[PDB]
């Protein structure tokens, strides 16, 4: 919207920046038993056939 | 199972520490809000005295 001034826009901006930083953090620090899942494009294979 | 329980204990303790961080941020922002109230009173006094 256009009712908010630049001084009012910097607050929304830094909030968005903090949210993006949190997104990066949770994307890079989540791991299951020592192996990460959101850092590489590789695929996982599960032996389900004996 | 040893690695699993290690991860479990670590994650539980880290969640507790995050809660402590929440509490610290809360008390700090309370102090900041009362300082803001004092500043607002100062601003009103200045508008009066100008």
Curated annotation (Swiss-Prot), chain A:
Belongs to the bacterial flagellin family. The gene is fliC. Coiled coil: none annotated. It is found in: Secreted; Bacterial flagellum. It comes from the Bacteria. This is Flagellin. Signal peptide: none annotated. The chain holds residues 101 to 150 of 548 of the full protein. Flagellin is the subunit protein which polymerizes to form the filaments of bacterial flagella.
